[PDB]
Design a protein around this ligand. Structure first.
Ligand code: HEM
Ligand SMILES: O=C1N[C@@H](Cc2c[nH]c3ccc(F)cc23)C(=O)N2CCC[C@@H]12
Ligand SMILES: O=C1N[C@@H](Cc2c[nH]c3ccc(F)cc23)C(=O)N2CCC[C@@H]12
Ligand SMILES: [Ca+2]
Length: 390
């Protein structure tokens, strides 16, 4: 069985449920991209055990030379590629909390909600249809990255970074050397500009890092991290969440009537809406055992968050979008020590988007869901456009 399963749209591959129901708690696959053997976990209970055992190491699975699911290493050649580790290493946990935590949300939620309303209001004033991907998600996610993470970017700089992320974070669709060069271009951009970006107005995280008590190569790796972790993820997820909402007008109607139910809908979108077409992954740093299956030192085990989020043993009717369902914690931000530190800002922008939609009932797709076209091969699913109208 080769990996990934080429399920580039919101329709999850049937392989995930087939492995979930199989008689083994971990299943062998082979990387289509490298030929590397890998282990794959699809059950919630097993995923909790793996992701909360620190002897399964994320950094070891990211290291140059690890068995891997990507066709190329996710780093500019000659660089370390372990930015968030390096930053927590140098003693910046405090600064990451300031730039990503509840205080950052308090600083930014005002303009984020103003911008979501402004973008939706301009679309509502247009005669004709519009594109929720290009006209709502792209400006909102670009503003999030610029104001809270990198600093003010020109349009051309934003486009270059967006292109680098779409070219480098891929299972297929580009040559290996094009994929590698995307990381080289991004790194060389931040070698030239990361310090410049820190010296602009704002409280964006890259400034906070650059002002804390770092070499240009380290600051450049911080910039590349914020692009790959913050830009295609937020844009892919907001696009997918809008598709989910547009396909559930009864749910939107309930949020319109009961705005206090929006936070529950945000959490259910994170469970229900698929994002990555690959898996979180960890290297066994010694011989380990998971639900009876031996994992030798150096072997890499992946967890599909999509598969876990749709596990019927965890969630009753897992394929139903049900805000306010009462089951366990979703896996949309992961689990354990590597739980997405962007979760506060992500939840902020997701909530701003849900509220903007819930205030304007009647918003609908201008084509059929099957006429939606998907970028093929991205790590993080994204439709090419979302034609919509009132
Ligand atoms: C402001 C935007 C975001 C920022 C700055 C951000 C930042 C990060 C960083 C730095 C990590 C690495 C943590 C580590 O390896 O210890 C991470 C992990 C993660 N992020 Fe985000 N993120 C953002 C948005 C998102 C979104 C929108 C999603 C999902 C919808 C998401 C899902 C995840 C997941 C699942 C992980 C865990 C990966 C793993 O366990 O290996 N992130 N994020
Ligand atoms: O910091 C990291 N953590 C893990 C998981 C992760 C978080 N965000 C991501 C965005 C793209 C991607 F391919 C992987 C990740 C990982 O694999 N990393 C390589 C690139 C960023 C790095
Ligand atoms: O496809 C991928 N997924 C991440 C882990 C992950 C799963 N779901 C996510 C949602 C958001 C995010 F930022 C990261 C992930 C990861 O390690 N990769 C290495 C190569 C493919 C990439
Ligand atoms: Ca190796």
């Amino acid at each position: 069985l080769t990996y990934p399963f080429h399920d580039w749209s919101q329709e999850l591959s049937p392989r995930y449920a087939q492995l979930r129901a199989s008689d083994a708690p971990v299943c062998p696959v082979v990387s289509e991209g490298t030929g590397d053997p890998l282990w794959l976990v699809t059950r919630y209970a097993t995923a909790v055990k793996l992701l909360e055992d620190s002897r399964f190491s994320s950094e070891a699975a990211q290291a140059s030379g690890a068995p891997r699911q990507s066709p190329v290493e996710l780093r500019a050649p000659g660089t370390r590629g372990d930015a968030i580790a390096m930053l927590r290493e140098a003693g910046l946990r405090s600064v990451l909390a300031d730039g990503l935590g509840p205080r950052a949300v308090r600083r930014h939620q005002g303009w984020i909600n103003d911008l979501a309303e402004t973008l939706m209001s301009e679309l509502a004033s247009r005669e004709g249809t519009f594109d929720l991907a290009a006209d709502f998600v792209e400006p909102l996610s670009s503003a999030l990255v610029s104001r809270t993470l990198l600093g003010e970017l020109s349009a051309d700089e934003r486009d270059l970074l967006a292109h680098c992320a779409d070219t480098g974070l891929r299972f297929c669709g580009v040559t290996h050397e094009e994929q590698v060069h995307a990381f080289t271009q991004m790194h060389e951009f931040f070698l030239e500009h990361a310090r410049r970006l820190a010296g602009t107005p704002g409280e964006h995280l890259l400034k906070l890092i650059a002002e804390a008590p770092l070499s240009d190569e380290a600051l450049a790796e911080a910039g590349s991290l914020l692009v790959v972790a913050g830009f295609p993820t937020s844009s892919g997820f907001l696009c997918g969440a809008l598709l989910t909402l547009l396909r559930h007008p009864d749910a939107v109607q309930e949020l319109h009537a009961h705005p206090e139910r929006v936070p529950s809908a945000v959490e259910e979108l994170l469970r229900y809406t698929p994002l990555s077409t690959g898996s979180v992954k960890r290297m066994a740093t010694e011989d380990l055992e998971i639900d009876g299956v031996r994992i030798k030192a150096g072997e890499v085990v992946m967890v599909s968050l999509e598969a876990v989020n749709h596990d019927p043993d965890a969630f009753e009717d897992p394929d139903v979008f049900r805000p306010g369902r009462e089951g366990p914690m979703h896996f949309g931000f992961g689990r354990g020590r590597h739980f997405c530190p962007g979760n506060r800002l992500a939840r902020c922008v997701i909530e701003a988007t849900v509220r903007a939609v819930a205030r304007r009932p009647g918003l609908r797709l201008a084509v059929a869901p099957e006429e939606i076209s998907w970028h093929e091969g991205l790590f993080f699913r994204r439709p090419r456009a979302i034609p919509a109208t009132w």
